[PDB]
Design an enzyme around this catalytic site. Structure first.
Site, PDB file in Angstrom:
ATOM      1  N   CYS D 107       0.860  -1.256  -0.095  1.00  0.00           N
ATOM      2  CA  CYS D 107      -0.045  -0.073  -0.071  1.00  0.00           C
ATOM      3  C   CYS D 107       0.814   1.269   0.056  1.00  0.00           C
ATOM      4  O   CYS D 107       1.420   1.721   1.010  1.00  0.00           O
ATOM      5  CB  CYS D 107      -0.951   0.057   1.258  1.00  0.00           C
ATOM      6  N   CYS D 110      -0.324   4.121   2.069  1.00  0.00           N
ATOM      7  CA  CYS D 110      -0.697   3.954   3.568  1.00  0.00           C
ATOM      8  C   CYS D 110      -0.142   2.800   4.089  1.00  0.00           C
ATOM      9  O   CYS D 110       0.933   2.431   4.594  1.00  0.00           O
ATOM     10  CB  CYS D 110      -2.190   4.549   4.118  1.00  0.00           C
ATOM     11  N   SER D 111      -1.117   1.793   4.486  1.00  0.00           N
ATOM     12  CA  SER D 111      -0.925   0.484   5.002  1.00  0.00           C
ATOM     13  C   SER D 111      -1.847  -0.588   4.626  1.00  0.00           C
ATOM     14  O   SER D 111      -2.025  -1.604   5.389  1.00  0.00           O
ATOM     15  CB  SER D 111      -0.886   0.911   6.325  1.00  0.00           C
ATOM     16  N   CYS D 112      -2.563  -0.423   3.804  1.00  0.00           N
ATOM     17  CA  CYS D 112      -4.086  -1.373   3.310  1.00  0.00           C
ATOM     18  C   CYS D 112      -3.603  -2.708   3.324  1.00  0.00           C
ATOM     19  O   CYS D 112      -2.578  -3.071   2.549  1.00  0.00           O
ATOM     20  CB  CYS D 112      -4.769  -0.738   2.085  1.00  0.00           C
TER      21      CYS D 112
HETATM   22 CO   LIG Z   1      -3.123   1.437   3.201  1.00  0.00          CO
END
Ligand SMILES: [Co+3]
Ligand SMILES: [Cl-]
Ligand SMILES: [Cl-]
Ligand SMILES: [Cl-]
Ligand SMILES: [Cl-]
Ligand SMILES: [Cl-]
Ligand SMILES: [Cl-]
Ligand SMILES: [Co+3]
Lengths: 202, 227, 227, 202
Positions: D107, D110-112
């Site tokens: 991601c 972000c961090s998905c």
């Molecule tokens: Co993310």
């Protein structure tokens, strides 16, 4: 410090201070530098150079049409003749503000600025906000300096990506009738020679 | 290198901190003055750097977190340390040990030495400068008024080709002459001068934005191609 | 927004900190656990955020210096605070004053409250989720296998169009269906769903690089145009 | 703090901790949250979910050819049937590693990460180094994990820019003859389901 995250931890400014003294000490001990060599540099950049040199050039351009014409046609030759030449001022170009063209100068990649003509750059000139934004939203940046240009005025941003340097020649304001060259020079602000301000009537 | 220093076109850095020029203090700590002395003193003698190309890459190589927090003259200390170690003028271990000494004992006395000849040498640099203008036998590839397209290249070493200007159409404004080529000179790989051009870019081309704005950028010949 | 969060293609962030998964601790401070509880607890009730679009823009709006230093769950605290104040659930002054209380007196006791019905409500969110798939009357503009060019647009609000993928040729890999449109939904301007596509990009197109690498990215219809 | 430079000064992590407690306190006092609502979330993400769910799916795919075929043709239906569905796992796609195709998931923005199937993402998955670099130099990144792919293996990087999520199905290694589905599941690492590692022979 978690070794997964050393990059979250900046050096404190005390580190940079200590590092500077360590470099100074080692270089002097090894005969590379001297106390007086270091001091000579500091005297030059803190005191000998300054925006008064550019201000003199601007006032001369306003008062002597022949000089202004010469300056704009070959600024490098003219500035060198005046003695405004040296390290980081070997090739200085003058860009003229006009009623419908406004010039603004930046070094997006660092801080490049013509020391022999203008002295040291403004604090903000070297920092990311100005550098990032002025090439993309110069009108918004100029508004933060109190300069709100009409949409009809064209803005030219000059990014100092080589060793070529740029000085803005601002326009002489109203209310200066009968002023001498000396008195006019006193009106020329540092900021006007970067393009972030016009000159106010006296 | 596509680093933290190449900020042109970035968002999020906030408002510009306006300050009246008369109040815009040059130095607030003596180590900042010292930084200036170290840079010019070394450069005047070709120590760690012969000109500003080597100087700039040492700053660009800073850890991003340091670049944003060191303050300006911290960049200068970083690049002096980097270049002096890189060229073998200073030993990294010795430099680290001495740094620790001054960390723990900041009032440690600095050795004194007068060298009037070195002062004159430094003056020569300050007043004579280090013009990078050269001559080459080749002719310029581009001419004033020509529409060019800047390349989509991503040098991992030093470059003066800002990311915001890459893969863009522009118009040659001036052919300056051949200048020392930063992408090589910063890495001590030779001056290898190339023609330097001023190139105008329109806001619509750079950003897709609608105002009467343009950017003039100086670009070396190898950053560009004909259309 | 062209922010610090949009890091794809950036250089200088360094080596990846490898850690054996068995040693890769989830939480090292209780406030990090709390952050998770606050996010899901609020989102489950539509407080400050109805889904993840509103959540993400609050993180993206962080001061860059905070984004890089807060640690991960600091992002989560930032966006909960941002969104709850932005929607009027909390007052900024009251929040600041209470923050100061816990700064100066960290052992200040937390009020206790059992609400089994709220627990069940939170469970519903956790297990039922918040699928953004919708239907619209329009047909997809693009088809599988079509070569498209992504737009050169620079939204100042939230977007899921990473800068590294802008103004690039790609090939439609799949038409997913219409999904809630982040660029509007993050700002509470309506779901306004658009067709979502998976698009393949070649390394040569993204970077001018020479390896057998590609990137698959999900892009909303309005991020792209036909060729 | 010099008001020209407030952006040089990060919030300390003690601020984020205090802010979290302030949010908790205010939300409970105003009746928006409860102690048990907060704890329910923590229990779910720290303990109830985990990569063992993905590991079960991988082991089932290795041992049941019909299941693998179904999984790859319509992973969303199949995963939901198994109960691996919920917040941030509403639409999960499985991408198959093959001898000449290696998949890696990120991601960048972000961090998905698909919590209902894999649990919480790795520490490094959420941090800038991996996120910035894996889309541009995946081979260099994978080498830092000890995966040195031949130039002839194609790498597909999947950037999780929508709510669609991706799980990598790694190949069954050599030396697993006679192993049960249960025993095979124990071999499936979290990292193999992101694409940063192959599975070692036992
Ligand atoms: Co993310
Ligand atoms: Cl580091
Ligand atoms: Cl003017
Ligand atoms: Cl860093
Ligand atoms: Cl910041
Ligand atoms: Cl700030
Ligand atoms: Cl594999
Ligand atoms: Co500069």
């Amino acid at each position: 410090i978690d070794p997964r995250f050393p990059h979250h931890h900046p050096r404190p400014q005390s580190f940079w201070e200590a590092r500077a003294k360590a470099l100074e000490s080692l270089l002097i001990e090894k005969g590379h530098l001297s106390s007086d060599a270091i001091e000579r540099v500091i005297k030059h950049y803190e005191h000998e150079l300054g925006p008064m040199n550019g201000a003199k050039v601007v006032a001369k351009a306003w008062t002597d049409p022949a000089f202004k014409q010469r300056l704009l046609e070959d600024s490098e030759t003219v500035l060198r003749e005046l003695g405004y030449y040296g390290l980081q001022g070997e090739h200085i170009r003058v860009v003229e503000n006009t009623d419908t063209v406004h010039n603004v100068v930046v070094c997006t990649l660092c801080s490049c600025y013509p020391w022999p003509l203008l002295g040291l750059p403004p604090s903000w000139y070297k920092e990311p906000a100005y550098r990032a934004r002025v090439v993309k939203e110069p009108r918004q940046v100029l508004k933060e300096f109190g300069l709100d240009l009409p949409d009809s005025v064209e803005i030219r941003v000059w990014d100092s990506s080589s060793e070529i340097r740029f000085m803005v020649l601002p326009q002489r304001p109203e209310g200066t009738e009968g002023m001498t060259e000396e008195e006019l020079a006193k009106l020329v602000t540092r900021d006007s020679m970067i393009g972030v301000a016009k000159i106010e009537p006296p | 290198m596509n680093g933290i220093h190449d900020v042109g076109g970035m968002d999020g850095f906030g408002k510009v901190m306006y300050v009246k020029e008369e109040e815009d203090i040059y130095f607030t700590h003596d180590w900042e003055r010292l930084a200036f002395g170290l840079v010019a003193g070394c450069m005047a003698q070709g120590l760690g750097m012969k000109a500003f190309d080597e100087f700039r890459i040492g700053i660009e190589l800073m850890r991003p977190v340091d670049y944003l927090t060191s303050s300006y003259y911290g960049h200068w200390i970083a690049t002096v340390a980097y270049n002096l170690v890189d060229t073998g003028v200073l030993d990294e271990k010795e430099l680290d040990e001495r740094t620790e000494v001054f960390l723990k004992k900041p009032d440690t006395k600095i050795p004194r030495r007068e060298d009037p000849a070195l002062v004159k040498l430094v003056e020569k640099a300050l007043y004579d400068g280090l013009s990078p203008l050269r001559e080459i036998s080749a002719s310029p590839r581009f001419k004033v008024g020509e529409r060019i397209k800047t390349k989509n290249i991503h040098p991992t070493g030093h470059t003066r080709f800002p990311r915001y200007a890459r893969d863009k159409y522009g118009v040659i404004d001036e052919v300056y002459g051949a200048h020392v080529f930063p992408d090589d000179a910063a890495h001590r790989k030779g001056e290898n001068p190339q023609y330097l051009y001023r190139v105008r870019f329109e806001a619509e081309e750079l950003w897709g934005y609608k105002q009467k704005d343009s950017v003039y950028i100086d670009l070396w010949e190898s950053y560009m191609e004909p259309v």
